[PDB]
Design a protein around this ligand. Structure first.
Ligand SMILES: C[As](C)(=O)[O-]
Ligand SMILES: C[As](C)(=O)[O-]
Ligand SMILES: [Zn+2]
Ligand SMILES: [Zn+2]
Ligand SMILES: [Zn+2]
Ligand SMILES: [Zn+2]
Lengths: 316, 312
């Protein structure tokens, strides 16, 4: 407690400011940006596009992003440090595993995965020293055996360091419920867990029941509807406020500036559907919520206070 | 006239005794740099590799071909460090093995062709260290994505002259499906090694491929360590007239993360010779069976040189 690790070193919690808690510089695969940078035009072209997009978001009020790219999403932390410095936006890096682990991860025990997540939080990522400030885990269906090991290793690393856990779900399958059961079996407090992609939920009662248990609800992919409207997703934010669960809400774009882990040219399709990029939350969602009558203090709580509480390393 | 190595180009006569299917590390993309303590440390793995390569050099090896691809975790800076310190030539590979990430799996044949060309003609990552071989792995009857990898490999080989080497299940005669695809792209069989052929129960499968001009990779002899029975496949192909089609190797590794933990210790206990197994055990065994030294030198020196020299 008192400081959050970022790609340019520790910051105090008051420095984080407006924080987008689920974003990516680049959605890729381990080793890929280094082995084939011209897939993105060039490494310099991707960095320049990410710096302009982050400066765009900064001019709309954002001061920090949490890049929830794991090892297997190709998360290159040296790129994050470079674009963080050039944009003057803090970036929190992640450990954990997403949905494309290679064999060298897939064959590991829970104890081995715990030591890997442990290494990225406590020592540093690769040979850069940059330490992770969050653990990202993805699951599908009812949670596969390997995904259950990842959740348990994540809980273990969280309990030893205080850094929170954030998840990838299918809300339409109520996937947070299985995640929550596994993480609680490990002794992890719900207040150290964000159940992500909860904006895609059709069932408000699924979200209300997780919030009432203390989970953070990641309404984190609002503009993916702009490519069910985005205003319908944003109304889940108002619904949880009106139910008294403002403190449980985290809002983000889930944007990216380059994508190789999908069909070629998807980034162009996405950018034409959401030209605001990571500024979509502050330029479109926040004004929409204001016009629906949500007061300033509540919107500042969601965008500043809740991420600060969530990211502050806590064992209390 | 020259072959790319991790220390730059060398002339064909420099390659000498060549093991054409080996690995410094069997891992996954990004993994050695993200989690080097899995191997004790990066330094410990490099030290183990240098000890093993120096042992192979003392036994007569002068070059190895490291057929680790991107998705086997190939770390061509590690290869360069241990090539220099062992003073053993290492040829690096492009291509794809059996664990491509989404960023590779979702690519077209044209995109994959550009990636393999990038690693042969420009360099691997930002090291400028060019690949001298293309490695391709397939499973059953060849999946749709594996077929794209073979076609891109054939295209890259036709544009550069560098050869193609494969991973099969010899028990499934996988080289027949591989060869049909490669030939549909116009690739000469003389620029293809069908690997893991030592595991075959069917000599007919190997002789038919050799009769078409394929190189036969009898590359995993010490993994069976009977290894004697696998080595007699070398004699069988010699006796049928196919000496010039034979390539032999150990398929050894100095670290392994792409498998259950501690497999490396099991392997090192069964084969303490490591990469020196071929020169110290297989070559003398074949000589005792009456194969002339000149034939063994052709298999370990001339065939490798003919295969690696870029052609067309
Ligand atoms: C990289 As994603 C679509 O799971 O946020
Ligand atoms: C890395 As292998 C066992 O296919 O030679
Ligand atoms: Zn996700
Ligand atoms: Zn995401
Ligand atoms: Zn193989
Ligand atoms: Zn191999």
């Amino acid at each position: 407690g008192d400081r959050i690790n970022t790609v340019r070193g520790p910051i105090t919690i008051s420095e984080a400011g407006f924080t987008l808690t689920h974003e990516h510089i680049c959605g890729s695969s381990a080793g890929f940006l280094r082995a084939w940078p011209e897939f993105f035009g060039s490494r310099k072209a991707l960095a320049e596009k990410a710096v302009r997009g982050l400066r765009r978001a900064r001019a709309a009020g954002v001061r920090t992003i949490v890049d929830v790219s794991t090892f297997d999403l190709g998360r290159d932390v040296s790129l994050l440090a470079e674009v963080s410095r050039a944009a003057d936006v803090h970036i929190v890096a992640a450990t954990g595993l997403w949905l494309d682990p290679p064999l060298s991860m897939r064959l590991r025990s829970v104890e081995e995965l715990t030591q890997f997540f442990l290494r990225e939080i406590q020592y540093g990522i690769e040979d850069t020293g940059i330490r992770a400030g969050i653990i990202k885990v993805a699951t599908t269906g009812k949670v596969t055996p390997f995904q259950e090991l990842v959740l348990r290793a994540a809980a273990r690393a969280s309990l030893a360091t205080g850094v929170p856990v954030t998840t990838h779900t299918a809300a339409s399958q109520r996937g947070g419920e299985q995640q929550a059961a596994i993480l609680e079996s490990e002794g992890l407090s719900p207040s150290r867990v964000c159940i992500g992609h909860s904006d895609a939920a059709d069932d408000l009662s699924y979200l209300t029941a997780l919030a009432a248990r203390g989970y953070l609800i990641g309404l984190d992919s609002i503009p993916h509807s702009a490519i069910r409207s985005w205003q319908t997703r944003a109304l889940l934010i108002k619904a949880l406020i009106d139910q008294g669960y403002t403190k449980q809400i985290l809002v983000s774009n889930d944007w990216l500036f380059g994508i190789s882990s999908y069909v070629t040219n998807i980034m162009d399709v996405m950018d034409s559907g959401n030209p605001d990029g990571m500024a979509f939350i502050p330029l479109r969602v926040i004004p929409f919520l204001r016009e629906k009558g949500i007061p300033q203090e509540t919107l500042a709580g969601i965008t500043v206070t809740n991420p600060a509480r969530f990211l502050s390393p806590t064992l209390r």
